[PDB]
């Protein structure tokens, strides 16, 4: 169907934009806020969003017969005042890509299509995994106030049977 194709192309575009903006965030975090390991963490998020997250969609298109568009336009206008607000912006972006995927899954079931449902299961799982990771990183900036302790913990972080 064409509804499914539109939804998948929108998710493609969203993933590309997220990857680019995350890369910029990682750079500004490492360089301006004196936190290299936060930079590595957000860089890994950005490389994940520009890697398999869209290669899988392109592969599915080549496989079943849909066609692919390309329209991305991003520009960074502001950068949060501290590390905490930045990590919270990241948390919000992920929290919304979750609901985007939920909408796509409902649409899939309502269209008598089941290959698309079996396919979108992967994103249903990865969304929650990534959210719990970024939240476990968010929950540090309240348990402490020293910067180097948080950085050491993130260092030892950057090195399940259902949600795994």
Please give the residues from 16 up to 35 whose contact with a copy of itself meets the rule CB under 8 A: 16, 20-21, 23-24, 27-28, 30-31, 34
The binding track of 114-133 with respect to Fe ion, each residue x by CB under 5 A or -, is: ------------x---x---
Please give the residues from 25 up to 54 whose contact with Fe ion meets the rule CB under 5 A: 48
User: Encoding tokens for residue 3?
Assistant: 């509804």
CA dihedral 11, 161, 158, 19 (to 10 degrees): 0
Can you state the angle between helices 147-158 and 36-49, rounded to 10 degrees? 40
Cα–Cα dist 116/114, whole Å? 5
Which partner from the list Fe ion, a copy of itself, none does 126 bind, CB cut-off 5 to 8 Å by kind?
Fe ion
DSSP state, 111? T
Cα–Cα dist 74/16, whole Å? 10
- Say whether residue 70 binds a copy of itself (CB under 8 A): yes
| Residue ranges that bind a copy of itself, judged by CB under 8 A | 16, 20-21, 23-24, 27-28, 30-31, 34, 50, 54, 56, 58-65, 68-76, 102, 105-106, 112, 114-115, 118-119, 121-122, 124-125, 128, 132, 139-140, 142-153, 160-163
């Amino acid at each position: 169907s064409n509804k499914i194709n539109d939804a998948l192309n929108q998710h493609y575009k969203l993933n590309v934009e997220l990857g680019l903006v995350y890369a910029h965030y990682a750079h500004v975090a490492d360089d301006e806020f004196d936190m290299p390991y936060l930079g590595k963490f957000i860089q890994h998020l950005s490389e994940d969003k520009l890697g398999v997250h869209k290669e899988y969609i392109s592969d599915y298109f080549k496989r079943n017969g849909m066609k692919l568009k390309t329209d991305v336009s991003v520009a960074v206008k502001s950068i949060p005042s501290d590390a905490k607000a930045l990590i919270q912006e990241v948390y919000a972006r992920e929290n919304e890509v979750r609901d985007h995927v939920k909408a796509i899954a409902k649409l899939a079931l309502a269209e008598d299509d089941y290959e698309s449902f079996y396919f979108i299961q992967w994103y249903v799982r990865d969304g929650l995994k990534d959210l719990t990771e970024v939240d476990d990183v968010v929950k540090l900036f309240n348990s402490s106030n020293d910067k180097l302790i948080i950085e050491e913990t993130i260092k030892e972080m950057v090195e399940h049977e259902i949600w795994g």
